[PDB]
């Protein structure tokens, strides 16, 4: 339909995509730092999605550098893709509103 | 059906090396990770390190002297485990594991007993 | 690192008795401790993942308990081919670890 309506999609496609290979890419580079936590795919999927929606319980997070940078790439897709929907919900509404107006 | 196979035996003089490998079949993934334990006569099980044959990347148990260089063969999904320099302290059956990424090894190697002398 | 500790060394009992091995963590690792089995010029082989979670192929008499830094290995009426070294690993925290292993005899 409408570009508002197409990016949600494409951000909750691409959310998701970077959901999976966050959670890899943290395992992968958190691994070989002693006392890291984040080392396996299941629990590493779990705080990828923890971290997209910024719900953050600490049970779980990256130490290393490559790891905070995989981090930070999760943060910022998960709060751009929900501030995308946010945004979206916007438009759908102001858009109702325009037509309840003869506007 | 046996996972992983390793040559029975090898036999190195001191200082010299050896390449050890672990040959796998069955279910194979990405995120499969090959990890070495060496075991001693006598003693319990030591982590020596892990692989990971996508991409490549390995890692090592930093509480001991670093003996090894673990790499693999995408092709022949074969791991490798480069011993140099080994000693009378470096004898033992090393085995080769499959860990797919959840913490636990599923399959173990019949295990390669390495015995250094001259 | 994590330090896992597995005490007695040794451990006797009567035949068809309950044993109990223990392997207590060095800091709280949740249940990410699973435990191996090895025999005589044996490989080690999977019993319990994951504490509890018991594996397809392994007796039903072998169970596991525990969470935080105290586990134990269950068999409920050992039998002669449970004569072996026992081991347990983390995996909670890098690098994964080993127990000293317990060794049972009947």
């Known amino acids: 339909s409408a570009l508002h309506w197409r990016a949600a999609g494409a951000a909750t496609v691409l959310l998701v995509i970077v959901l999976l290979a966050g959670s890899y890419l943290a395992v992968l580079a958190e691994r070989g730092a002693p006392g890291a936590q984040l080392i396996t795919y299941p629990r590493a999927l779990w705080w990828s999605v923890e971290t997209a929606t910024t719900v953050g319980y600490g049970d779980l997070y990256p130490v290393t550098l490559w790891g905070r940078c995989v981090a930070v790439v999760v943060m910022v897709a998960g709060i751009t893709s929900f501030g995308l929907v946010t945004a979206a919900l916007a438009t759908w509404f102001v858009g109702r509103e325009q037509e309840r107006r003869g506007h | 059906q046996v996972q992983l196979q390793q040559p029975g035996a090898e036999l190195v003089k001191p200082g010299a090396s050896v390449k050890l490998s672990c040959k796998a079949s069955?279910?194979?993934?990405?995120?499969?990770?090959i990890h070495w334990v060496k075991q001693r006569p006598g003693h319990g099980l030591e982590w020596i390190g892990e692989?990971?044959?996508?991409?490549?990347?390995?890692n090592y148990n930093e509480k001991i002297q670093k003996k090894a260089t673990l790499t693999a063969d995408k092709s022949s999904s074969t791991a490798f485990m480069q011993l140099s320099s080994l000693t009378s302290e470096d004898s033992a059956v090393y085995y080769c594991?499959?860990?797919?990424?959840?913490?636990?090894?599923?399959?173990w190697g019949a295990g390669t007993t390495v015995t250094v002398s001259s | 690192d994590i330090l896992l500790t597995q005490s007695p060394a040794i451990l006797s009992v009567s035949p068809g008795e309950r044993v109990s091995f223990s392997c207590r963590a060095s800091?709280?690792?949740?249940?990410?401790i699973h435990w191996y089995q090895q025999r005589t010029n044996g490989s080690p082989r999977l019993l319990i993942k994951?504490?509890?979670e018991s594996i397809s192929g392994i007796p039903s008499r072998f169970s596991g308990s525990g969470s935080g830094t105290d586990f134990t290995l269950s068999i409920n009426s050992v039998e002669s081919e449970d004569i072996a070294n026992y081991y347990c690993?983390?995996?909670?925290?890098?690098?994964?670890?080993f127990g000293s292993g317990t060794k049972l005899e009947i």
């Open positions: 594991a499959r860990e797919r990424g959840d913490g636990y090894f599923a399959v």
């Open positions: 069955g279910y194979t993934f990405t995120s499969d990770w």
């Open positions: 692989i990971i044959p996508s991409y490549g990347r390995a």
């Open positions: 800091q709280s690792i949740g249940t990410d």
């Open positions: 994951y504490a509890s």
């Open positions: 690993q983390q995996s909670n925290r890098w690098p994964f670890t």
